[PDB]
Write a structure and sequence with these properties.
binds calcium ion, 2 domains, Elastase, domain 1, binds zinc ion, six-stranded mixed β-sheet, 316 residues, 8 helices, hydrolase
Length: 316
C-alpha cells in the first residue's frame, strides 16, 4: 500500500518486545519500506489460501497474542535481509531487492514453515510439538535461504543435491542467528520446538547423531523417505560446516576451526559461483575447496581446514 513509513512496537512469540517498521495509511500495515522493495507480512487467518490479507492494525501497537507471530516473522525477515546485505552484499534473495513476503497463522495446528516458491509461510504449531514457527530466527532465515538457493545454484530438492539445499539453509540460518546475536547456538529450531521440554531442538549441527541423523557419509540414508532424505543426510554437511568453523576431532580426523565469518564467505561463494542444480556431495567438496582457494590461497590454513572437514565426514 502507499503511505507514510513509521515505527511500531510489539511483543514477539517468546514475549520479548521489539520495534517494527510499519506503513501508515488509515490503518497501520506490516509493510517495511526501509529494506529493498519491501517486507510485507500477511494474515492467512487459519486458512491455506495464500497470501491472505496484508496485516492491518488500528494503533501501531502489536501486543495481542494473535499478533506475536506476525511481529516475529516481520522483524526476523528484516534481520535476515540485513545479514545478506551487510555481510555478503546481496540485495534481497534474488540479488535485485525483490520484496519479501510472509504469511502467518497458516492453517490450524500446522507444525511447519516453508518457502513455497514465492513467499514464506508459517504455521502456529499445535502448542506442544511447536509454538508458532516464526518465533525462531534460525527458522525464518532457514526458510529465506531456500529462496536464495533457488535464485543462485538452484539445487534440486532430491537426494544429495536436496540434502545440500537443506544444509545450506541450516548453515546460514545459524549464521544469521549468530549475527543477531542473542543466545546463538549450533542447533536448529530450539526456540520453537517442544515448549514443554528444555535442551532439545529439531536438528543439531554440532552433533547430528544426537537425533539420529548421520554424521558420516558411510551412514547416509539411501531410501525414498523425505525425498531421499533431504533433512536427514544434511546432517553430514552440517557436521562438516561445524568442524570448519569451530574445529574438533571427528572419527579420528582433526580439523582446525577457521571461525564463522570465513565459513560464511566460503559457503556463500560456493553457493553463488560453483554449485549447480545437480551438484552432489563430492562436487560440494570441490566447490568449497575452490572457493577457499579463490579467497585465501591454495596453501592457506583455510583450504586445509576445508579438506580436513570433508575427510572427517567421509566425503571425497
Ligand atoms: Ca494494535
Ligand atoms: Ca538459539
Ligand atoms: Ca539455533
Ligand atoms: Ca523444547
Ligand atoms: Zn529447508
Amino acid at each position: 500500500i502507499t503511505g507514510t513509513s513509521t515505527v511500531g512496537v510489539g511483543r514477539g512469540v517468546l514475549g520479548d518486545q521489539k520495534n517494527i517498521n510499519t506503513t501508515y495509511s488509515t490503518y497501520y500495515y506490516l509493510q517495511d519500506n526501509t529494506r529493498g522493495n519491501g517486507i510485507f507480512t500477511y494474515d492467512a487467518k487459519y486458512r491455506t489460501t495464500l497470501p491472505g490479507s496484508l496485516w492491518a492494525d488500528a494503533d501501531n501497537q502489536f501486543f495481542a497474542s494473535y499478533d506475536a507471530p506476525a511481529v516475529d516473522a516481520h522483524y526476523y525477515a528484516g534481520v535476515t535481509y540485513d545479514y545478506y546485505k551487510n555481510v555478503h552484499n546481496r540485495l534481497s534473495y534474488d540479488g535485485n531487492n525483490a520484496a519479501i513476503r510472509s504469511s502467518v497463522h497458516y492453517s490450524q495446528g500446522y507444525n511447519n514453515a516453508f518457502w513455497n516458491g514465492s513467499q514464506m509461510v508459517y504455521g502456529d504449531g499445535d502448542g506442544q510439538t511447536f509454538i508458532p514457527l516464526s518465533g525462531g530466527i534460525d527458522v525464518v532465515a532457514h526458510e529465506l535461504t531456500h529462496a536464495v538457493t533457488d535464485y543462485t545454484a538452484g539445487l534440486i530438492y532430491q537426494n544429495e543435491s536436496g540434502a545440500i539445499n537443506e544444509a545450506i539453509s541450516d548453515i546460514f540460518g545459524t549464521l544469521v542467528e549468530f549475527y543477531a546475536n542473542k543466545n546463538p547456538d549450533w542447533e536448529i529450531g530450539e526456540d520453537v520446538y517442544t515448549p514443554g521440554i528444555s535442551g532439545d531442538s529439531l536438528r543439531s549441527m554440532s552433533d547430528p547423531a544426537k537425533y539420529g541423523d548421520p554424521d558420516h557419509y558411510s551412514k547416509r540414508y539411501t531410501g525414498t523417505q523425505d525425498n531421499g532424505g533431504v533433512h536427514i543426510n544434511s546432517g553430514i554437511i552440517n557436521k562438516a560446516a561445524y568442524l570448519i568453523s569451530q574445529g574438533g576431532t571427528h572419527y579420528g580426523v582433526s580439523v582446525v576451526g577457521i571461525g564463522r565469518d570465513k565459513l560464511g564467505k566460503i559457503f556463500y561463494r560456493a553457493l553463488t559461483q560453483y554449485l549447480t542444480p545437480t551438484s552432489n556431495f563430492s562436487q560440494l567438496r570441490a566447490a568449497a575447496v575452490q572457493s577457499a582457494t579463490d579467497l585465501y590461497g591454495s596453501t592457506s590454513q583455510e583450504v586445509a581446514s576445508v579438506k580436513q572437514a570433508f575427510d572427517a565426514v567421509g566425503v571425497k
